[PDB]
Design a protein around this nucleic acid. Structure first.
Ligand SMILES: [Zn+2]
Ligand SMILES: [Zn+2]
Ligand SMILES: [Zn+2]
Lengths: 99, 87, 93, 147, 110, 80, 94, 99, 83, 109, 95
DNA sequence: TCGGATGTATATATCTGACACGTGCCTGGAGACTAGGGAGTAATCCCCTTGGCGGTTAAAACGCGGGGGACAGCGCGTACGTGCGTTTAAGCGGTGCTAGAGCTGTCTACGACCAATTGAGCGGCCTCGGCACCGGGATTCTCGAT
DNA sequence: ATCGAGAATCCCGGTGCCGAGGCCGCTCAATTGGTCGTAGACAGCTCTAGCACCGCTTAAACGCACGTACGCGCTGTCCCCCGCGTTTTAACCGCCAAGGGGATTACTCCCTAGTCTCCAGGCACGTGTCAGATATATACATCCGAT
């Protein structure tokens, strides 16, 4: 039979890989399109400096990474290892982002 | 007689339907939002930049939608006025 | 003695316009003083950073207007700008 | 206050007769309703005197009323229990509507059958395949349960 | 406005305009304080005070009291949504809290 | 339209891995897109307000940095 | 003759249908407009608004109705009492 | 047999009672002694205005009440109704008071 | 005039009342020691700053305004005691 | 110490004292700026910079790289305690994050 | 036309570096971060001292105001060492 | 379902001190005038942002098999809520003392302001070494086989 | 327990590129010297409020007994994420072209700071009175055991 790693080993390998590096993890062009779409609803005919889009992506990725850490602690608190929607909602409530 | 009571009763209505600038039978009435004032569409489309010329309240909406209910009360009044004159 | 400044007399005036009968307790008046002072600091402070970012040296009205758009949440913002604009237009002319 | 609203509704329906449809109570009980409609020609349901039973919640017009048809009607949605999957009668009910509004709205829904959300399989399927025989079958059922 | 009266009246407000002008000058916010800023800022402050006082008055009338007390201010600010988000971090003295019990704790209804 | 769908399923998983998450429920992905959109709206809303006030038509890096700062997300590395 | 005042009552029958609440279907008790310039009674509104925790939907056309958004019109309140006066003189003189 | 309410009913009665009122819940004199003890370790021979002690007690009680709300949400998340030390610790970590 | 074990003056019933206002229905026996430790840390942070304002003015009395300023700079703004 | 030189060297630091003086004056922080404040402020800023650069230089030596990059600044700030408490909210661009796997997730015998 | 000049703390941070690690360079992106950090800390201390001098109705930011702002802004051990360095520099300056 | 026992909302007399209002005054706000510099406007220029190929290929989408985790159910034994009799100290009122906050007057040493000037710091150019990359090899976890 | 095949990861040497560190010319901001008005330090005096104490009343804290709701562990089931192979979509990159508008310079003028004079807006202070707290007594809603 061909080789297969057990479920969970590769997940741990990826955790070590992405915590070791610093490169951005969202694809550049799809994120840029999203920023422009949101901006058109506030003011038409806007232009963006290239560094402005980069600053938005750095902040967004840092925020989501920090949020996933808090979400993981909530899952472990309930004696689970799988994060679920109710875990994110609890984290955001205690942080004060949604009262 | 001759429905003189109706004419007095009718005229009491139109004293409540006066443009705050045109001071006449207000045609295509419009309120620009943010205050109680209603005018004629002709005399406010110019003053949209400076706001309401009575309240000094700024204009809230770029377009000038015409209030259908205030439209209805005017055309009905004219038909009521014409019928009450028996023409 | 020494002389203190406060918004006591003015808060009471605004009250008697929106509720001609209800008074207001002393402790509640202290809370309103602190609230007015706090909001003044926020708006003024934000207007100062705008003037400094744009290299200006004058807190005009529009600087206050952009600060109000920043601080106050959505629906409150649309109303306070309208109220302030109305006051300036009436004051000028 | 829904009772008072329906009293003025009866009074308004009295001072303004709707187009070929009538309404009334179920006796001396007010929270149910019996009505009749007559067949429109812009629809496969002509000639059918259609009974409508209607039950109202307590906060009319806040939550939507519910209806049932006492006829087995060849309709892509209206089942044998006469219930209709109507979004403006369950989930999209705006508190400004009245009974005559929904009555003409269902007359229109009768005028234009909707096979998008079905509750009976065969009617809607034959509807979405063949119009001539659907018309034939629809008219036949209406004659049976109305003439 | 042609009137040569007190600037508060000439703007139609109730809050002082001369006092706000001074506080903006002596406060080291900027070197030059335009002549438009105090009227605008006094108007904004007056509007916000009217909002909170109206809501607080409603709550005091509900409790059949004719005199606003700090508890009514806390009730008015938290029940509203935009006013709560503006005063999210503030703590009103003698304010109590909002009466609410988590749904899971209520007795076992059938 | 629908450009929120460009934040694909593998991209969200990668971000979760950096946060130390080992196993992920299927519904997380749709939840994450919604929370991200709310965050962007708030920052861009403030950024454009600075742009309009300066009578500019290009959103600058400083606009974004100032917007993030006033929300307590101070960002180093793009000036300021 | 034909008692042509039926047309007059036809006119007055059209009067309430513009000056009636679209929710509680009474005479406009205390008028309140919206951004969309739709008129209500501010009791059927507050009975419509308090049960929703967040922005509501206009009963006729649009979305995003809020207690702050509405404003006390008091443009039709005096119209309503005028309309009753218009009717009242009719029975006295006909 | 004498009358006894079941366990939990009186707890709910007290919740309604204390959420309805606004009076301070810590005894005045024991709290005042605590404030003075802490202050002596920073600077000897300090005096306090009476209003200064009250301001400290208002802030402290408001903080603990807010903390207990977050703690309750963490307990319910774990399908419990009893708050425990680990519930407080999780709430404080996500709030950012102890990283 | 030294003082000892004053934090134990924050009694079990007092902590119980605070939890009740927070909507808590059932309380584990171990909560009380945890709460005392948490309460003490909060006061140290605030009093440290309050005394620092007092020292700067070369005063010996901590005023209400001193405490209000300390709470404000921690993002725990307090209404009702001046300022 | 008395001298007629640049105020920086006279104070013995590595930072401008004139530039900090001008920034305190033209910043609307107060009406008058004492003559002793800019020296104190330049000293404090220099001390903080020296701390962060020492730790970051260590972290770069650890990776056998002879030139600091943003990654090393992030490591030196998070690993320390007081510095991480001072820059708690700040986000370092291109900074990565500390390697930290929760214990429960690790494999088990 | 000639580009207007933009000030920065680049050369001064570089001097401090070569004192602590006389052989380790620093890359441009790392330099931008250190530059932004100095600006942010300067703003915190200065703004706090301004608020502090206004509470006591003073009009001057003396050195004593900066000392108290440092005590209020930094954690325990950092506050103790930074105050020491500041006092040393001021007394060496005046003497 | 049902009658008890218990806690809670409601209605009424009554009594106190906090609130609302009148007065003297005084200090800060309003009004008239002058001057100077900050900001608005016009014109320009060249930097950089949008837009578009076209080729490559890393990465996303899809389908499938299965195994490990989510979740419900049961049970058991300890922890905690409720009630009560007892003991402790908080709260209150009243009194005496003075430490220190607060204000006024006087006087000078410190910082602002201004004109000349000269060297530290910035813009631009350029080169070599540190780091990125790639290929091959050593080794080291991982899983299934017993 | 173990050991062997299979991937994965770490180490090392050679090659190439482009960005960091240093040099040079030059503008302009920091420095020096002198003058001058005033913010602030310091002495002195007042008297407000903080601290200490003492006796009394009673509300709250406390220790104890008891019974039961629930926290925690074990088991079993099924279903839904994970790993992996294959194919399809679109990101990425290198390149070229156009022109919008950000940045800069010169000019002009009107808006705000600064000064002086004058007077009424608002605040401390004193006083009367009714809104609300209290205390008693009811009606009424709710909980719980036993049907
Ligand atoms: Zn108007
Ligand atoms: Zn008109
Ligand atoms: Zn109505």
């Amino acid at each position: 039979k061909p080789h297969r790693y057990r479920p969970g080993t590769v997940a741990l390998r990826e955790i070590r890989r992405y915590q070791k590096s610093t490169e951005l993890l969202i694809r550049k062009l799809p994120f840029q399109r999203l920023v422009r779409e949101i901006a058109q609803d506030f003011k038409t005919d806007l232009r963006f400096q290239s560094s402005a889009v980069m600053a938005l992506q750095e902040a967004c990725e840092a925020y989501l990474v920090g949020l996933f850490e808090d979400t993981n602690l909530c899952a472990i608190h309930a004696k689970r290892v799988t994060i679920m929607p109710k875990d994110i909602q609890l984290a955001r409530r205690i942080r004060g982002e949604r009262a | 007689g001759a429905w003189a009571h109706s004419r007095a009763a009718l005229d009491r209505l139109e004293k409540l339907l006066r443009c705050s600038r045109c001071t006449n039978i207000l045609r295509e009435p419009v309120c620009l939002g943010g205050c109680e004032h209603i005018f004629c569409s002709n005399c406010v489309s110019d003053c949209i930049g400076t706001g309401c010329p009575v309240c000094y309240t700024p204009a809230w909406i770029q377009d000038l939608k015409i209030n259908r209910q205030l439209d209805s009360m005017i055309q009905l009044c004219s038909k009521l006025r014409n019928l009450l004159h028996d023409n | 003695r020494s002389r203190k400044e406060s918004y006591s007399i003015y808060v009471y005036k605004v009250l008697k316009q929106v509720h001609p009968d209800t008074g207001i307790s002393s402790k509640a008046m202290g809370i309103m003083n602190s609230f007015v002072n706090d909001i003044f600091e926020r708006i003024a402070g934000e207007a100062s950073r705008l003037a400094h970012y744009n290299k200006r040296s004058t807190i005009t009205s529009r600087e206050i207007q952009t600060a109000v758009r920043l601080l106050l949440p959505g629906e409150l913002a649309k109303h306070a700008v309208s109220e302030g604009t109305k006051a300036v237009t009436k004051y000028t002319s | 206050s829904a009772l008072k609203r329906i009293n003025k509704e009866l009074s308004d329906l009295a001072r303004d007769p709707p187009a070929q449809c009538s309404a009334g109570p179920v006796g001396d009980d007010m929270f149910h309703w019996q009505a009749t409609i007559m067949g429109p020609n812009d629809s496969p349901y002509q000639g059918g005197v259609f009974f409508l039973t209607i039950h109202f919640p307590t906060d009319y017009p806040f939550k939507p009323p519910k209806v049932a048809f006492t006829t087995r009607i060849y309709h892509p949605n209206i089942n044998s229990n006469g219930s209709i999957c109507l979004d403006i009668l369950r989930s999209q009910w705006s508190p400004a509507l009245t009974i005559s509004k929904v009555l003409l709205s269902i007359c229109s829904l009768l005028c234009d059958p909707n096979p998008d959300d079905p509750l009976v399989p065969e009617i809607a399927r034959i509807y979405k395949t063949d119009r001539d025989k659907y018309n034939r079958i629809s008219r036949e059922w209406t004659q049976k349960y109305a003439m | 406005s042609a009137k040569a009266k007190t600037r508060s009246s000439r703007a139609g407000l109730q809050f002082p305009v001369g006092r706000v002008h001074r506080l903006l000058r002596k406060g080291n916010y900027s070197e030059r304080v335009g002549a438009g800023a105090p009227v605008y800022l006094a108007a904004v402050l007056e509007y916000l005070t009217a909002e909170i006082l109206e809501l607080a008055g409603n709550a005091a009338r509900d409790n059949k009291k004719t005199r606003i007390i700090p508890r009514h201010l806390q009730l008015a600010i938290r029940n509203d949504e935009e006013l709560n988000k503006l005063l999210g971090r503030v703590t009103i003295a003698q304010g109590g809290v909002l009466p609410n019990i988590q749904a899971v704790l209520l007795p076992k209804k059938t | 339209r629908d450009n929120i769908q460009g934040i694909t399923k593998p991209a969200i998983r990668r971000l979760a891995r950096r946060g130390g998450v080992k196993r992920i429920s299927g519904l997380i992905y749709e939840e994450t897109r919604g929370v991200l959109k709310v965050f962007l709206e708030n920052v861009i809303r403030d950024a454009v307000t600075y742009t309009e006030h300066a009578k500019r038509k290009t959103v600058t890096a400083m606009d974004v940095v100032y917007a993030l700062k006033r929300q307590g997300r101070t960002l180093y590395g793009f000036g300021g | 003759s034909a008692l042509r005042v039926e047309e007059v009552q036809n006119v007055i029958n059209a009067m309430q249908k513009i000056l009636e609440c679209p929710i509680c279907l009474e005479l406009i008790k205390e008028p309140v407009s919206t951004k969309c310039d739709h008129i209500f009674c501010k009791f059927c509104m507050l009975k419509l608004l308090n049960q929703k925790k967040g922005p509501s939907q206009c009963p006729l056309c649009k979305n995003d109705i809020t207690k702050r958004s509405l404003q006390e019109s008091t443009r039709f309140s005096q119209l309503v009492e005028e309309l009753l006066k218009i009717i009242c003189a009719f029975q006295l003189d006909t």
